[PDB]
Amino acid sequence: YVSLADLERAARDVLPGEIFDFLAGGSGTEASLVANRTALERVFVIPRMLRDLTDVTTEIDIFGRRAALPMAVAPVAYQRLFHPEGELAVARAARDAGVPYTICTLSSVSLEEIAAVGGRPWFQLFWLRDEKRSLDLVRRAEDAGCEAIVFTVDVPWMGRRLRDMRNGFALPEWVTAANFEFAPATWESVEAVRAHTDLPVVLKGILAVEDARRAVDAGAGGIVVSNHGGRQLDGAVPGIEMLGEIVAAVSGGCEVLVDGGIRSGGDVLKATALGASAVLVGRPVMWALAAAGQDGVRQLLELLAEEVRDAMGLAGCESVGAARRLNTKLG
Amino acid sequence: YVSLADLERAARDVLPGEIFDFLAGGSGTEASLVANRTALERVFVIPRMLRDLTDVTTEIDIFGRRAALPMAVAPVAYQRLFHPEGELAVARAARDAGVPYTICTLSSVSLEEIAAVGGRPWFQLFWLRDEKRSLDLVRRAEDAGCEAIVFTVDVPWMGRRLRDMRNGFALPEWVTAANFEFAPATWESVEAVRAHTDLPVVLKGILAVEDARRAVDAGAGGIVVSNHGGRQLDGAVPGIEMLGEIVAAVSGGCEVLVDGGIRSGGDVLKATALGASAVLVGRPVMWALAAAGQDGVRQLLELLAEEVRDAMGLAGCESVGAARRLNTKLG
Amino acid sequence: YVSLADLERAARDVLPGEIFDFLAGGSGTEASLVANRTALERVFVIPRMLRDLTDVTTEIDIFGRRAALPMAVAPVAYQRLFHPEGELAVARAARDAGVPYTICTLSSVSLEEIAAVGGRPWFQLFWLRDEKRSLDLVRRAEDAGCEAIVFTVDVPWMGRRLRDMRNGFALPEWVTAANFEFAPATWESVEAVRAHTDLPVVLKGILAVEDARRAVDAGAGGIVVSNHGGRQLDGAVPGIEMLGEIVAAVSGGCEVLVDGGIRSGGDVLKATALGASAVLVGRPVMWALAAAGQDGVRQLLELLAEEVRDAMGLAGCESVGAARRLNTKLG
Amino acid sequence: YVSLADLERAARDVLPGEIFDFLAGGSGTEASLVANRTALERVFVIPRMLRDLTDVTTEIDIFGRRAALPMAVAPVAYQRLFHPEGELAVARAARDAGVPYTICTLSSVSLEEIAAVGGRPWFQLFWLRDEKRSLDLVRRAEDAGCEAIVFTVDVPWMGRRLRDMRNGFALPEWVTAANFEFAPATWESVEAVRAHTDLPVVLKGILAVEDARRAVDAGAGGIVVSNHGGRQLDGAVPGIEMLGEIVAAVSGGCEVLVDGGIRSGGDVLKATALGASAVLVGRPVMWALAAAGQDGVRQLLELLAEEVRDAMGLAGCESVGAARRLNTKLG
Numbered sequence A, B, C, D: 001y002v003s004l005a006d007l008e009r010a011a012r013d014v015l016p017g018e019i020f021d022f023l024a025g026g027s028g029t030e031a032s033l034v035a036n037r038t039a040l041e042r043v044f045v046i047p048r049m050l051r052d053l054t055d056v057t058t059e060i061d062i063f064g065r066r067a068a069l070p071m072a073v074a075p076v077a078y079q080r081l082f083h084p085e086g087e088l089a090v091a092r093a094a095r096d097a098g099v100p101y102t103i104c105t106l107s108s109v110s111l112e113e114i115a116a117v118g119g120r121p122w123f124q125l126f127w128l129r130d131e132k133r134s135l136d137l138v139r140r141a142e143d144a145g146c147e148a149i150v151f152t153v154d155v156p157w158m159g160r161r162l163r164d165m166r167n168g169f170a171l172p173e174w175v176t177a178a179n180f181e182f183a184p185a186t187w188e189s190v191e192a193v194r195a196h197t198d199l200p201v202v203l204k205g206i207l208a209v210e211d212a213r214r215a216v217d218a219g220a221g222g223i224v225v226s227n228h229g230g231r232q233l234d235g236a237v238p239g240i241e242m243l244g245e246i247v248a249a250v251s252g253g254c255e256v257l258v259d260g261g262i263r264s265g266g267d268v269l270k271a272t273a274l275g276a277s278a279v280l281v282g283r284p285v286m287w288a289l290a291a292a293g294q295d296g297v298r299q300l301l302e303l304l305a306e307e308v309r310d311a312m313g314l315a316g317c318e319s320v321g322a323a324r325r326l327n328t329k330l331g
């Protein structure tokens, strides 16, 4: 595999159509799904030359841990849909690559099993109709050694997935929510979580500048600027189009991550240059899992690592901090 | 049917080609027809998160009536072209859905019959060469219980419909103007109508900011920002491209509706976020009528209602007023 | 024929390929040829409503004559290439339609014969290596009753026509320059012409704002803002993209015409709304000539007249002056 | 051959696929490769009319030599890949056309042999792991009569060429680096070179404005604003998009060249109008070499010369300096 695009072809071959569609699809007309890609394609980097590259490092410190790349595996529900080892395969590969892995509320293997893999994982929370259930998940995650709570705030309910409707998609009997519905979360829910844990709380799905500011005021340790991979509001702006404005508004008050459409080390560089602390990567990790299990995810992460190093050095950046100081131009 | 686009395919199957073309077509090269779609596709919504969605309501108050959605059925002439029950089928479905229905001057069933369906309908006026005929229609409409006069101001004569010319299109003998030519309307005509009725007068086909301002000065209760679905001046700007500027200029002095290319609840949200009080929907209602009569229109309206509710909540809006305060970004 | 595009198809059928290519083609990669169309397609008109249209008139006064439309036939060399009656057929149709016809220096029928048709024609001048020959043409044109000298200033030599090169195109033996090489014209040449005639001198091929200003200072009665239909500098800006800036800079000091890509009455309206006094139309007139001779050109001009009237009225303009006060929006 | 595009077709026919791909390809997704073309296509020239063109000259003075055109042959490694005479064929044609030829560090014929061809050549330097080797090349180049050192600064290592990876591309045994690895160059390396030679040092691969300024401060005689033909950082801005800003910032302190996507005399004109002193041309010279050896390159250079003269005169420019004063408009 020489690009992330090689793996999508491989995953389409192996997966049942309705499962590939559950993975690939977005809401509505898939306008936001396509825009996530279009938005990255319009960004060009202005590289610097003639800088010292004797010790190029792609490492970052985030939420109290060193990570090997400015990247984490996005929360993707029900990974046993894609490979029988599901979340364990992905978590093992992430651990070995030094990349944080986000354990999902809707994981198909229990959060404690995935945490036991090691690698200092994060935990993604959905707010549930029974509040105590959500707060119990938080405490479970913390007890199991998760290092951040990624509170997904853009799912008061699931978006309208027309592929899933047309396919009549449902989970196979062999895939379940192993940690066991959606309730709208509010700012009150955020405070309840913040009071229940000393872990950093990261709000995922922020697109409005004022919501980013309020996240900082609320004590969030980070935000993920995200339209949920085009799966929630169809017509929601891409995160990458809001990122610079949001970075400016928070002015270092929390970590600002982005996701949606990251498909190369060059895309990571673009996100960094627009001010991201790190990115999340979703669909490509699942392509790799479907194509070749743990080894597939390993190969994907090694490829991404090489592409990030390559892009950084070609752009004159010996560190991720330097990459954040790069300028960009829209084309 | 899971999207409005499902119904267009269904209508193309059933309708005679020349009738589908009368419905689908625009004037000239259809530049304005296509631009109505392009303009909506370029708008992205910046959703809000973490707001109370315990009682999301899509209702509005407009022209003294509660409506279930920020939407009305656009005036479309000669609905018996599309289904034998024509306007009665559409009016019944609109009534049952709590959506205003606009009875046309060129309706193929008499305005009194359509009004008797109930549902507090509106009446669309064309100015005719014989002025007294136009004012008589106004009084007929008012006597029959119509609640607003939608004065269409963008048809001094019919635009050049090249599909209709190429097809040699003419009304079948079985379709007539049941209320029984065009004269240019002027501001004087508007005043004559305003003096003849206490109903709100709504000027449909306004695109210039100064004309919106003058509409308010003239005592209009509303305007519809509209290029007549691309059927009149070919090269006329889409209403959606003028809407924000017009909303700012009238500064609450009348209701500001928009139409042209609305094809989903997400499109309704975009229009609302740009400042519209409500939208009109034309072609899709006729697709539904052609495909399945009254039940087809019912299904379309239920689908639109669900999509509007979905989009609003995903965008953090518990009310249409909140949706009007959303920001947008061009992509 | 219901659009100008109908006639292109008809002309392609009848003409020999190399002649159609001489007509259709541009220089280089045809970037400027395509951009002339793209530029018009991006312009949208903001129409006005509710204005008095009791006596819509498309007439203008220009260079001391009333014209039926804000349009003239562009200078196109060697019209016998397209039909045996060549320039006489086109001039007769233009006369009958009340549209000025521009007689070319490279006409395939003598300028005196074409002038004898009537219709108060214009004469297009090329500066020739022998200066006295150019000034003799001016005097011939004036003696024959031409009413303006259209001095083409964008042909110091012919552009690189790759279609003509690839085809090995040459004039048939039966087509000649009946008035009988290129020398670069300069501002000195303009003054020589201005001193030799009391007719208005119109400089055709102006694109720079400073050149438009200088044209006024030089005593020009008009300019044609033009990239020569994409046939001269490949990569030259379309005239329509410079027109508004040029109109502002000359501030009524001369007539400002535009050409390039005008294919409908709506396009005429766009040009007018951007500030043009009138347009020239080239290729479509030749399509009509090729398709059906004099009657073809008559039908084209009647179609254009109807489209101009239609567009003007739909846009709320009872006169061309009103159309010039319309606003536009780029899409 | 009537355009540069004719020669690409010819080269594709003759070359082995993997060699054509080594030539044509870029890094990553080839975003920067495509953008080099897109960027030029969006630029339109505003030509001037009515200027004296009695003695149009395309000559420039650069780095102490007159050149026949504002153009040089870009450094392209391993020219024996494309034709058996390789660099000697290209250098001979360049000499005869009065165009500078850039001898590569990775030339497949020794720099002394290519210099012996004559034509006052330039020498392109890569910084090598063994510094003394790089400085020895500089002295060799100077001793052999090269007139400028083009220090390529955008290759700390080779970009990721997915075509080459997929093809398993390697040099044939019959092609070698005849002057005999990459080390990142720094500003210190630039100073070492500047101290080692009195020849002008030209830094190739500058895209950031601050790096252009620093180049002047460092004593560079020129820069080449360049993304290395889209072969290095995928997502790097095209040079043509940075050129105007860079020209303004250096404010005559060094020569500013550009490359990437130059495919015609019109493109040369665009670059000049944006402020370039001269351009480099890469791939097209290799197409000509592959298609027809020395004579092919001769024909290409004669074609480019004619296109440059044509474009300049059509734009009203009797000199390259005049062309630099042309204005442009984005379309």
Ligand SMILES: Cc1cc2c(cc1C)N(C(=O)C[C@@](O)(CF)C(=O)O)c1c([nH]c(=O)[nH]c1=O)N2C[C@H](O)[C@H](O)[C@H](O)COP(=O)(O)O
Pocket: A022, A023, A024, A036, A074, A075, A076, A077, A104, A105, A106, A124, A152, A155, A157, A158, A159, A204, A226, A227, A228, A229, A230, A231, A259, A260, A261, A262, A280, A281, A282, A283, A284
């Ligand atoms: C591809 C994908 C994504 C999600 C999920 C599944 C699949 C298959 N999640 C869910 O499916 C949960 C949900 O069932 C809720 F309605 C859904 O979206 O279908 C998943 C999710 N984000 C998140 O916070 N939790 C989730 O569990 N997401 C969103 C991701 O975290 C992330 O924002 C996107 O993958 C980023 O875009 P990419 O990198 O894919 O372009």
Ligand SMILES: Cc1cc2c(cc1C)N(C(=O)C[C@@](O)(CF)C(=O)O)c1c([nH]c(=O)[nH]c1=O)N2C[C@H](O)[C@H](O)[C@H](O)COP(=O)(O)O
Pocket: B022, B023, B024, B036, B074, B075, B076, B077, B104, B105, B106, B124, B152, B155, B157, B158, B159, B204, B226, B227, B228, B229, B230, B231, B259, B260, B261, B262, B280, B281, B282, B283, B284
């Ligand atoms: C699709 C369609 C629309 C009209 C009509 C017919 C058909 C088939 N009307 C007419 O046909 C009248 C007319 O014969 C006059 F020349 C014509 O346009 O053909 C119709 C009309 N608008 C209006 O105010 N009265 C009409 O009667 N319109 C315009 C609509 O009210 C409305 O502006 C558009 O449907 C909005 O765009 P959509 O929602 O279709 O994208």
Ligand SMILES: Cc1cc2c(cc1C)N(C(=O)C[C@@](O)(CF)C(=O)O)c1c([nH]c(=O)[nH]c1=O)N2C[C@H](O)[C@H](O)[C@H](O)COP(=O)(O)O
Pocket: C022, C023, C024, C036, C074, C075, C076, C077, C104, C105, C106, C124, C152, C155, C157, C158, C159, C204, C226, C227, C228, C229, C230, C231, C259, C260, C261, C262, C280, C281, C282, C283, C284
């Ligand atoms: C289509 C066409 C145009 C010309 C000419 C021929 C043909 C076939 N003329 C010439 O061919 C002269 C010339 O041989 C000189 F090099 C050439 O362009 O080939 C013609 C001409 N404009 C002009 O002022 N005199 C000409 O004689 N032009 C340019 C036109 O006046 C006018 O600017 C364009 O037709 C406007 O674009 P359109 O309306 O075609 O989009």
Ligand SMILES: Cc1cc2c(cc1C)N(C(=O)C[C@@](O)(CF)C(=O)O)c1c([nH]c(=O)[nH]c1=O)N2C[C@H](O)[C@H](O)[C@H](O)COP(=O)(O)O
Pocket: D022, D023, D024, D036, D074, D075, D076, D077, D104, D105, D106, D124, D152, D155, D157, D158, D159, D204, D226, D227, D228, D229, D230, D231, D259, D260, D261, D262, D280, D281, D282, D283, D284
């Ligand atoms: C087409 C091409 C270009 C290079 C080279 C080879 C080939 C086949 N060079 C190299 O291949 C060296 C290298 O092996 C290093 F990694 C590579 O790019 O593959 C070549 C080079 N530029 C340069 O300064 N030295 C080189 O030797 N370049 C870049 C060119 O100097 C120049 O910047 C581009 O050709 C400009 O774009 P074009 O005019 O091609 O659109």
